[PDB]
C-alpha cells in the first residue's frame, strides 16, 4: 500500500527558504520516480517536479526553475523538495505522489507552505546524516537552513559528548573560505550549497573521540578563531554520531 507524508512546511517572507520532506512507506520507493505538485486557494493541482527512482534525472515547472530543487534519499525512503528564493505566488498546499503528476494524493496529505509579508523573520537550522560506523569509516552529516536566511554570513559545526564541554570544529563563509579545530584537520571537510541553503560536514578516518552529538550553527557576523565560531545566533537540535568497533 502506497503511504506518502508531507512535512516541513511553514510561514515564511518572501526570499525565504524551505525545505519539505516525504516520507514513503509500504511500497518499492527506491524502484519509482517520485513527483511534488501544490494546489493554491481555488486553483487546480499543479505540477512543480518529477525525479527519477535513482535520483539521476529531474525535471521542474518553468515557474519554479533555477529556485526549487528535488531531491531524494532512498536509503531512508525520503523524498525532498528545497524551496529557495521563495515567492508570495508560491504560497499552497503541497503534495507528494507517487510517479510523474499523473498520480492523485491521498486523504490526509500535504503539508502547507505560506509566503507573505506578514509572516515572521526567522531561521531554523535542522541537521540530518547522523549514524553508527565503525573506527575508520567516514559519514555525511547535512544541515538544512530555512526561513529568512539572506543575513547569515557564516555556518559552521559543533560537537558535545557527555561528560565534556562544547567544542566548535569548523566554520565556513558565503564564500567558502574555511577554517577548522586541529582536532578534525584533514579528517573533516566542511562544504556548502548556499544556492540550496545546505551545509555539509563530511568526516572521514573517523575515531571514537568522534562520538558526539553534532550541531549546525550559523550567525549574521563571521566570528571565528580555528574552527570555533563565537557570537552564534542560530543553531540546531543534533545529530548523534557514534564510532565504534563491535
Known amino acids: 500500500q502506497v503511504q506518502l507524508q508531507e512535512s516541513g512546511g511553514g510561514l515564511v517572507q518572501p526570499g525565504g527558504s524551505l525545505r519539505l520532506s516525504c516520507t514513503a512507506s509500504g511500497f518499492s520507493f527506491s524502484s519509482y520516480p517520485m513527483t511534488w505538485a501544490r494546489q493554491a486557494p481555488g486553483k487546480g493541482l499543479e505540477w512543480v517536479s518529477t525525479i527519477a527512482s535513482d535520483g539521476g534525472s529531474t525535471a521542474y515547472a518553468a515557474s519554479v526553475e533555477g529556485r526549487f530543487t528535488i531531491s531524494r534519499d532512498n536509503a531512508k525512503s525520503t523524498l525532498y523538495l528545497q524551496l529557495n528564493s521563495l515567492k508570495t505566488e508560491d504560497t499552497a498546499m503541497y503534495y507528494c505522489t507517487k510517479g510523474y503528476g499523473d498520480g492523485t494524493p491521498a486523504p490526509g496529505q500535504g503539508t502547507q507552505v505560506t509566503v507573505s509579508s506578514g509572516g515572521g523573520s526567522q531561521v531554523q537550522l535542522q541537521e540530518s546524516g547522523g549514524g553508527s560506523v565503525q573506527v575508520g569509516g567516514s559519514l555525511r552529516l547535512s544541515c538544512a537552513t530555512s526561513?529568512?536566511?539572506?543575513?547569515?554570513?557564516?555556518m559552521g559545526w559543533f560537537r558535545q559528548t557527555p561528560g565534556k564541554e562544547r567544542e566548535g570544529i569548523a566554520a565556513?563563509?558565503?564564500?567558502?573560505?574555511?577554517t577548522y579545530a586541529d582536532s578534525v584537520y584533514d579528517r573533516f571537510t566542511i562544504a556548502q550549497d548556499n544556492a540550496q541553503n545546505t551545509l555539509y560536514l563530511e568526516m572521514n578516518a573517523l575515531k571514537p573521540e568522534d562520538t558526539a552529538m553534532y550541531y549546525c550553527?550559523?550567525?549574521?557576523?563571521?566570528?571565528?578563531?580555528?574552527?570555533?565560531?563565537?557570537?552564534?545566533?542560530?543553531w540546531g537540535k543534533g545529530t548523534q554520531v557514534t564510532v565504534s568497533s563491535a
Open positions: 550553527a550559523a550567525q549574521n557576523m563571521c566570528r571565528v578563531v580555528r574552527g570555533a565560531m563565537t557570537g552564534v545566533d542560530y
Open positions: 526561513g529568512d536566511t539572506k543575513s547569515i554570513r557564516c
Open positions: 565556513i563563509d558565503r564564500e567558502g573560505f574555511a
